[PDB]
C-alpha cells in the first residue's frame, strides 16, 4: 500500500489517475488550492484532499512532510495556450517554476520520492520531425509551451544531477467523457447530444480539416503509472501515432448519435446534413475557422510500447463512441 500525491486532482487526468491508483490499492492524496469528476467516477470519498499551491514554496515543503508520499504526479497547471498569451508570467510561475518547487521540496524533505512531470506535445510546437519522438528537437510556440519545456528540462536535470527518480511524460492529446467542454472533442459530442434533444440547433466549429493525435485518457494515465514502476527513470512520448480530422470525429459521433450526416459544401461554408431530417446539424463559423496548420503533431510512442509494454487498447472509433454515448446519457438527465 503506497501513498501517491496528485496535483491537478480535479482535472481529467488527476481524476482517472486517482481511480487507477485506488484500484491498485494506493492511498490517494489529491492536491488542491467538491469535484464533479471524482464524483462521476464515484471516488470523491476515497480521495484524500489536501491543500497545496504551486505558486508558493513553503506550503509545498510542508505538504510533502505531512503526506510523505512514495509517488508524486504533477498533473497541475494552467493548460490553456490562449490564456498563456494573456497571463504568460502567471503561467510560467505554475507550469515552469512550480515544477521546480516540487522537485526542490522533494530534494529537501524526501529525496526517495518518485516524481512524474506532465509534459506536452505542445513543446514540439513547430515540429522539427514527423512523427515526433523523444529525440525530436523542441520548438515551443506559446508562453505555455515554453513554460512546459522548462518543467521538462528541470525534471531531467534533477534526475541527472541528484539521481532522483524523476520522469517526464511528453503526452499528446487525450480525451474522455471527463474532458472539458472547452475542448473540441467534448464540444462535438456534448453539442450533438443536445441537438438530438432540441436543447440546441446547430454545432458550430472551425476548420474541419484540423488534424490531431487523439488518445483515450484512462490509458494515458496508465502509461504515467507504468513509467513510475520501472527500475530506472526516463521520459516517454505517449500517443497513438495516427491523426484524424475534426470532420472524422464529428461525422463518426453524429453517426453514433443516430444522425445520418452527409457533408456538402467546402471551406468556411461546409455543412453536415442529417439525411434523416434534412436540416443542417453542423456548420463552420469564421469565429472558429483558422488557417490550416502546416505543422502536424503526431507522436511515435514505440519507445513506450517497447520498454513499458504500453499500448492504446481503444481504437479511434471506440473513443468516439465512448464520448458520444456518455454525452447522450448526460443530456437525457
Ligand X SMILES: Nc1nc2c(ncn2[C@@H]2O[C@H](COP(=O)(O)OP(=O)(O)O)[C@@H](O)[C@H]2O)c(=O)[nH]1
Identified binder of ligand NDP from the candidate list 4, 6, 14, 19, rule CB under 6 A: 14
Nearest distance from residue 74's CB to ligand NDP, in Å? 7
Identified binder of a copy of itself from the candidate list 1, 25, 181, 198, rule CB under 8 A: 181
Q: Using the structure block, give the residue that is written with the C-alpha cell 468516439.
A: 320
Among 219, 262, 255, smallest CA distance to 328 is for 255
212 annotated ligand-binding residue: yes
Residues 207-226 touching ligand X, rule: CB under 6 A, are 207, 210, 212
129 is catalytic: no
Q: Candidates 23-31, 163-171, 181-189, 304-312: pick the segment binding ligand X (CB under 6 A).
A: 181-189
Q: Candidates 7-15, 124-132, 268-276, 288-296: pick the segment binding ligand NDP (CB under 6 A).
A: 7-15
Q: Give CA angle at 284 (278, 288), nearest 5°.
A: 155
**Interaction of residue 13 with ligand NDP, rule CB under 6 A:** yes
Among 277, 153, 174, smallest CA distance to 224 is for 174
Q: Which residues contact 202 (CB under 8 A, 6 or more apart)?
A: 195, 280, 281, 282, 283
Among 41, 292, 332, 77, smallest CA distance to 190 is for 332
**Interaction of residue 170 with a copy of itself, rule CB under 8 A:** no
173 annotated ligand-binding residue: yes
Torsion of CA 42, 36, 184, 311, to 10 degrees: -30
Measured in degrees and rounded to the nearest 5, phi and psi for residue 187 equal -60, -40
Measured in degrees and rounded to the nearest 5, phi and psi for residue 178 equal -90, 0
Q: Are 235 and 119 in contact (CB under 8 A)?
A: yes
122 is catalytic: yes
Pick 3 or 107: Cβ nearer a copy of itself: 107
**Interaction of residue 122 with ligand X, rule CB under 6 A:** yes
**Interaction of residue 225 with a copy of itself, rule CB under 8 A:** no
Q: What is the 3-state secondary structure (H, E, C) of 151-206?
A: HHHHHHHHHHHHCCCEEEEEECCEECCCCCCCCHHHHHHHHHHHHCCCCCCCEEEC
* Pairing outcome for strands 203-205 and 47-51: unpaired
**Interaction of residue 57 with a copy of itself, rule CB under 8 A:** yes
Identified binder of ligand NDP from the candidate list 5, 8, 21, 235, rule CB under 6 A: 8
290 annotated ligand-binding residue: yes
75 annotated ligand-binding residue: yes
The binding site for ligand NDP (CB under 6 A) comprises 7-8, 10-14, 31-33, 52-55, 75-79, 94, 118, 120, 171, 173-174
Known binding site for NADPH: residues? 12-13, 32-33, 53-54, 75, 77, 79, 148, 174, 179
Site residues for ligand X per CB under 6 A:
81, 122, 173, 183-185, 187, 205-207, 210, 212, 246, 288, 290, 293-294
Amino acid at each position: 500500500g503506497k501513498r501517491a500525491l496528485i496535483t491537478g486532482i480535479r482535472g481529467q487526468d488527476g481524476a482517472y489517475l486517482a481511480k487507477l491508483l485506488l484500484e491498485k490499492g494506493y492511498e490517494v492524496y489529491g492536491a488542491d488550492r467538491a469535484s464533479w469528476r471524482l464524483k462521476e467516477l464515484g471516488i470523491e470519498n476515497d480521495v484524500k484532499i489536501i491543500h497545496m499551491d504551486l505558486l508558493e514554496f513553503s506550503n509545498i515543503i510542508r505538504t510533502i512532510e505531512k503526506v510523505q508520499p512514495d509517488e508524486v504526479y504533477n498533473l497541475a497547471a494552467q493548460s490553456f495556450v490562449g490564456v498563456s498569451f494573456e497571463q504568460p508570467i502567471l503561467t510560467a510561475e505554475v507550469d515552469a517554476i512550480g515544477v521546480l518547487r516540487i522537485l526542490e521540496a522533494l530534494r529537501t524533505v524526501k529525496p526517495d520520492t518518485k516524481f512524474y512531470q506532465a509534459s506536452t506535445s505542445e513543446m514540439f510546437g513547430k515540429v522539427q520531425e514527423i512523427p515526433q519522438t523523444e529525440k525530436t528537437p523542441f520548438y515551443p510556440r506559446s508562453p505555455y509551451a515554453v513554460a512546459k519545456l522548462f518543467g521538462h528540462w528541470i525534471t531531467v536535470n534533477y534526475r541527472e544531477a541528484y539521481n532522483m527518480f524523476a520522469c517526464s511524460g511528453i503526452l499528446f492529446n487525450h480525451e474522455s467523457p471527463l474532458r472539458g467542454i472547452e475542448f473540441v472533442t467534448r464540444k462535438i459530442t456534448y453539442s450533438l447530444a443536445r441537438i438530438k434533444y432540441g436543447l440546441q440547433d446547430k454545432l458550430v466549429l472551425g476548420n474541419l480539416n484540423a488534424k490531431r493525435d487523439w488518445g483515450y485518457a484512462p490509458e494515458y494515465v496508465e502509461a504515467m503509472w507504468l513509467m513510475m514502476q520501472q527500475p530506472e527513470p526516463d521520459d516517454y512520448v505517449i500517443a497513438t501515432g495516427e491523426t484524424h480530422t475534426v470532420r472524422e470525429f464529428v461525422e463518426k459521433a453524429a453517426k453514433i448519435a443516430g444522425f445520418d450526416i452527409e457533408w456538402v459544401g467546402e471551406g468556411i461554408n461546409e455543412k453536415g446534413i442529417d439525411r434523416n431530417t434534412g436540416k443542417v446539424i453542423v456548420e463552420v463559423s469564421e469565429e472558429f475557422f483558422r488557417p490550416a496548420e502546416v505543422d502536424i503533431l503526431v507522436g511515435n510512442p514505440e519507445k513506450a510500447m517497447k520498454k513499458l509494454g504500453w499500448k492504446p487498447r481503444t481504437t479511434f472509433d471506440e473513443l468516439v463512441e465512448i464520448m458520444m454515448e456518455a454525452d447522450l446519457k448526460r443530456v437525457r438527465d
